Amino acid sequence: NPESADLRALAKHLYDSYIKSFPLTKAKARAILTGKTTDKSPFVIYDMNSLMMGEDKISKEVAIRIFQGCQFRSVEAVQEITEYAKSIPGFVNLDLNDQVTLLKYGVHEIIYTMLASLMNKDGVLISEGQGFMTREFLKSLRKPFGDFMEPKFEFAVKFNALELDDSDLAIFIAVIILSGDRPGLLNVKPIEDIQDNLLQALELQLKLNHPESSQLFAKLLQKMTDLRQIVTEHVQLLQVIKKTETDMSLHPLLQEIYKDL
Ligand SMILES: CC(C)(c1cc(Br)c(O)c(Br)c1)c1cc(Br)c(O)c(Br)c1
C-alpha cells in the first residue's frame, strides 16, 4: 500500500547509491571469503614473511606500516561515506554545519559497521579483498599496536551473526548518519524527521527481508552501543600513539574527526 510503497521506494534508492558509493560490498566480501566462483581467492598474510611476500603487489617498520595503511584506507572510507550521505534524501538540504557535524561523528561508527562485512572470526579482507590478514597476526603486533583490531573483530562477530545483507546495511548506515543527538547540532528537529523516516524504512526492510527473524530491528538498533564503544576505545588508543610515537604522522582529515569526539 501507498505508505509501504513510499518506504520500499526509499529502500531501493539507498541500496542503489550504496552500491554506487562502495566498491567492496558485503556480497562481494562473502564471495571472496567463503570460496565462491564469481570472485578471486585472496592472498593470505599470517606472519612476517608472508607479509613480505604479499608486499610485492596487493617504510618505518611492520606494525607502524600496517597501521598507517588502515588509516589511509579510513580516509578513503570517509570519502565513500561522504558521497553516500549526500545521496540521503534531505541530507544536503540541512544546515551546512550540521551536515559537517553529522559526518564528524558518523563516519567511524559506519566504518566499523561495514568493516564487519570484510571480517570473519579468523581475519579481515584488505587491499580491496585481494588480501586477507589474519586476526592472530594483527593481535601479535608489538603493543600498543597488537590491540587496535581486536575490538573490531569482537563487534564484527556479534554483528555478523545478525546476518544482514547490503540492502539492510544501506538503510542502517543512513540511520546512523542522521542521528539527531550529536554534539553541537544547530537544528536537531529536521534531522530527526529524516531519521524517523529512515527508521521506518528499516523496520519494513528487515521485516520483509528477514521475516523469520524475531525483533531484528530492535536487535540491530541495540548494536549502536557497541559501535560507540569501539569508537571511543579507538580514540583512546590514538591518544596513546600520538604520545609515544611522535614521529608517526596522522592524516589531517582524520585529525579533524578525532578532535573532541
Ligand atoms: C585493515 C582494513 C580492514 C581496515 C580498514 C579501515 Br577503513 C580501517 O579503519 C581499519 Br582500523 C582497518 C583494511 C581494509 C581494506 Br579493503 C584495505 O584496502 C586496507 Br589497506 C585495510
Curated annotation (Swiss-Prot):
Rosiglitazone binds at Q71, F72, R73, S74, H108, H234, Y258. One of its GO terms (cellular component) is chromatin. Residues 6-260 form the NR LBD domain. The 9aaTAD motif is a transactivation domain present in a large number of yeast and animal transcription factors. One of its GO terms (molecular function) is nuclear retinoid X receptor binding. Nuclear receptor that binds peroxisome proliferators such as hypolipidemic drugs and fatty acids. Once activated by a ligand, the nuclear receptor binds to DNA specific PPAR response elements (PPRE) and modulates the transcription of its target genes, such as acyl-CoA oxidase. It therefore controls the peroxisomal beta-oxidation pathway of fatty acids. Key regulator of adipocyte differentiation and glucose homeostasis. ARF6 acts as a key regulator of the tissue-specific adipocyte P2 (aP2) enhancer. (Microbial infection) Upon treatment with M.tuberculosis or its lipoprotein LpqH, phosphorylation of MAPK p38 and IL-6 production are modulated, probably via this protein. This is Peroxisome proliferator-activated receptor gamma. The keyword Endoplasmic reticulum does not apply. One of its GO terms (biological process) is positive regulation of low-density lipoprotein receptor activity. Keywords: Activator, Biological rhythms, Cytoplasm, Diabetes mellitus, Disease variant, DNA-binding, Glycoprotein, Isopeptide bond, Metal-binding, Nucleus, Obesity, Phosphoprotein, Receptor, Transcription, Transcription regulation, Ubl conjugation, Zinc, Zinc-finger.
